[PDB]
Amino acid sequence: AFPDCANGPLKSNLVCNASADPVSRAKALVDALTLEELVNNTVNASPGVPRVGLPPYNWWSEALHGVARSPGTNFSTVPGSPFSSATSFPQPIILGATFDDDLIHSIATVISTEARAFNNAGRAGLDFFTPNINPFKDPRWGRGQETPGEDPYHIAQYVYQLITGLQGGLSPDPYYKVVADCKHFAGYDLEDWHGNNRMAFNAVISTQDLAEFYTPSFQSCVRDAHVGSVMCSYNAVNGVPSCASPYLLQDLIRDHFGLGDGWITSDCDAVDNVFDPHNYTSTLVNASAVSLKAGTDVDCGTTYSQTLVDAVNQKLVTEDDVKTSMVRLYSSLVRLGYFDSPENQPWRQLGWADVNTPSAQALALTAAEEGVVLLKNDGTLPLSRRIKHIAVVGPWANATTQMQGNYQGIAPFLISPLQALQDAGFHVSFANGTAINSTDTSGFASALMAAKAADAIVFAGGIDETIESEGHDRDSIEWPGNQLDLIEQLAALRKPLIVLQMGGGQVDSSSLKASKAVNALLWGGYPGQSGGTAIVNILTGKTAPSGRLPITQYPAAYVDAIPMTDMALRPSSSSPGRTYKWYTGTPVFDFGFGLHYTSFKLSWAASPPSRFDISSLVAGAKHAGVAFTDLAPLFTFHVAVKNSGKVTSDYVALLFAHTTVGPSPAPQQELVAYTRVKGITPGRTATAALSVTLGSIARVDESGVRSLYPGKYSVWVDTTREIMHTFELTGKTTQILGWPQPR
Ligand SMILES: *[C@@H]1O[C@H](CO)[C@@H](O)[C@H](O)[C@H]1NC(C)=O
Ligand SMILES: *[C@@H]1O[C@H](CO)[C@@H](O)[C@H](O)[C@H]1NC(C)=O
Ligand SMILES: *[C@@H]1O[C@H](CO)[C@@H](O)[C@H](O)[C@H]1NC(C)=O
Ligand SMILES: *[C@@H]1O[C@H](CO)[C@@H](O)[C@H](O)[C@H]1NC(C)=O
Ligand SMILES: *[C@@H]1O[C@H](CO)[C@@H](O)[C@H](O)[C@H]1NC(C)=O
Ligand SMILES: *[C@@H]1O[C@H](CO)[C@@H](O)[C@H](O)[C@H]1NC(C)=O
Ligand SMILES: *[C@@H]1O[C@H](CO)[C@@H](O)[C@H](O)[C@H]1NC(C)=O
Ligand SMILES: O[C@@H]1[C@@H](O)[C@H](O)OC[C@H]1O
């Protein structure tokens, strides 16, 4: 509910004055309240102040890939009633696999519209814990499915588009739409691997790796997309918990990245974790005091509302710190149109008629269509027009809730691969033959019986929330259970066999890759509510595959080569490396790898430059329409992408760069640009504009400073190195972006 700024008790307070400054309105509201009232409102499940007519407000609300279940959200218990469902989009891993920034922005707009519609019915808050922009650096993280991938630049572009779409633009032009919250600011990418609990895990991260990998996403989020909120994670960095670290929360988030007087929520009772089990403070009150002084403005729990009074009395914190945090929160609320009349807010006029819009359903289907990656095909795909009898088999064959991942809402419909095959008029023989993880072969027979008389076998399996989830990291990155045995038996029939590998993290498909009896292999991840229809549209040829792998499919033995606790990415005497840019082994399928139903010819649409002076680039940086030097351009490629095949398709141009200059070591590759050229009809030649900035070409040294270094740089366009171009930077090395040193 919202206050009554027309007749209620706050009507004569400056907080109810729309003409006044938002920060001044928050100040007027906070000065009107009692210190203890302020304290009992410093938590996510705030009760408001019944004296002044301030209604309750739950800050903990979830909408990762669509309006999700959360403490701040309820869905109508009646299945067909209004607000019983919401557009459940596919997991952000497949969404990053789309590599479509326009699509990500439109999805963010849909999510924000539906969140506003739910809030107008008293069924959702106005701030949402989204997105999760922690890089999926270790292949066996349970929550890496919630993230776009493993590339900090790709995640940066994703989060820029998503924040701008959710919040309603690059600025609160009038009011916010919804307030976002970039998740877990730290080196958080571990749940319980070998007993290392995130709530007691001490991540050791070098400043170089800190600024080069774990923070670019948050810098793009709060500095370039101007987010309204950030969340500090459970883990500790270099011995200090994040929510209690002034260097992480103040020196970087509020200052270097410029969150300013936006509000920082703690991970849910991570403030309590600072005491138990992080052991960091001797008393609980001291834990909450250090958390507050470090920058944590609101606690997702109950630690603040029952300890901050004692902290003020024990002189650990002052009344003014509580008032500062409350002013930040209430100022974001003022910007959300909390204290303004509904007559002047179109976003407050949204209802149930705006939720399951056909545009939203079609956009979810399109996201799934663009996100699925074709890993292998011998020409069996697209399915022959003469194929009529298909056998669908596997633990993912009739997937419905598995298709949603985690942090989801109740979808209006869950179209399974089986249901979609039936929707396309296929004579389907179904059998799930084995579970996700089991040794029971008793279903194999059924599978075989369903497939022995079929024109095509479609095995659909992999992993799901039973294998990877919040609080359960994977121990093996292989096909769980006896799934590979069933695939092998199906391949003994030597029919057209198509294997669908699902789930967030990758599983070792090298056995499938090497077997000639396996004709086609796709990765489906969590394709959302319309996932089956998208997969079948790709199979039949209705939609051409165009997605590309956002993460590396490591071979199995990788789990033995590096511990999940090793936060360093570079190789060494005990590290094969991390991610595509440092890994020294031979991945089964590379980052950015993808197949199409058509062949492409890539050339130059404009002769590329080959020489740049660093000082000239830095000087011209002040004249480009950017506010920070690292956002200024270095150059823009114009690739000519010709469709030399016979099928229309989209193409994802993935501009990679490699240098041997600047700080050693220097990565293999680094995704410095990417674009999605949509719908290239056969024969036609479309132009791909690929823009590289100074911040993506510069190098991060031991000090964590981003600077330009002279020498030879090479750049190519695909994982197959379609075209390549080598230029040189000359002149003197110039610092582009400083870095506050650890306090
Ligand atoms: C808001 O305050 C200003 C003075 O700061 C006053 O002139 C204006 O009338 C007030 N608006 C309302 C709606 O009371
Ligand atoms: C503290 O919070 C409780 C809700 O659990 C509320 O009843 C009480 O009034 C709050 N204290 C003050 C001083 O408002
Ligand atoms: C959802 O709304 C109904 C009535 O609007 C309310 O009674 C119920 O408690 C809400 N659900 C939750 C989980 O708060
Ligand atoms: C950890 O807790 C123990 C008490 O069990 C205490 O003696 C020790 O000083 C603590 N160490 C740290 C680093 O918190
Ligand atoms: C497929 O799943 C749906 C929902 O889980 C269920 O209603 C249906 O019976 C299943 N189909 C088969 C053939 O098991
Ligand atoms: C597929 O598995 C579900 C439970 O996982 C079960 O209800 C269903 O019966 C299975 N399919 C068949 C054909 O038995
Ligand atoms: C399969 O389940 C077992 C527990 O029964 C688990 O230890 C193992 O990690 C799972 N396999 C995979 C590949 O995740
Ligand atoms: O990632 C967060 C998780 O740690 C918490 O337990 O639930 C809310 C999420 O935002």
Numbering used by the authors: 1 to 743
Article passage:
Here, to gain a better understanding of fungal xylan degradation systems, which can enhance enzymatic saccharification of plant cell walls in industrial processes, we conducted a comparative study of two glycoside hydrolase family 3 (GH3) β-xylosidases (Bxls), one from the basidiomycete Phanerochaete chrysosporium (PcBxl3), and the other from the ascomycete Trichoderma reesei (TrXyl3A). The xylan main chain is degraded into xylooligosaccharides with low DPs by xylanase, and these products are further degraded into xylose by β-xylosidases (Bxls). PcBxl3 consists of three domains: (β/α)8 domain, (α/β)6-sandwich domain, and fibronectin III (FnIII)-like domain. The relationship between substrate specificity and degree of polymerization of substrates suggested that PcBxl3 preferentially degrades xylobiose (X2), while TrXyl3A degrades longer xylooligosaccharides.
The structure of PcBxl3 with xylose bound in the catalytic center was also determined. The conformation of Glu470 (PcBxl3) is the same in the native and liganded structures of PcBxl3, but Glu492 (TrXyl3A) has different conformations in native and liganded TrXyl3A. For instance, Asp267 in PcBxl3 is located at a distance of 2.7 Å from O2 of the xylose moiety bound at subsite −1, while Arg166 and Asp291 in TrXyl3A are located at distances of 2.7 Å and 2.8 Å, respectively. Glu62 and Lys183 are located at distances of 2.7 and 3.0 Å from O4 of the xylose residue in PcBxl3, respectively, and Glu89 and Lys206 in TrXyl3 are both located at a distance of 2.7 Å from O4. In addition, Trp60 of PcBxl3 and Trp87 of TrXyl3A are located near C5. The amino acids surrounding the nonreducing end sugar moiety are well conserved, but PcBxl3 has Phe129 as the residue corresponding to Tyr152 of TrXyl3A, indicating that subsite −1 of PcBxl3 would be more hydrophobic than that of TrXyl3A. In PcBxl3, there is no clearly detectable subsite +1. In the crystal structure of PcBxl3, subsite +1 was not clearly identified, but that of TrXyl3A was clearly visualized in the crystal structure.
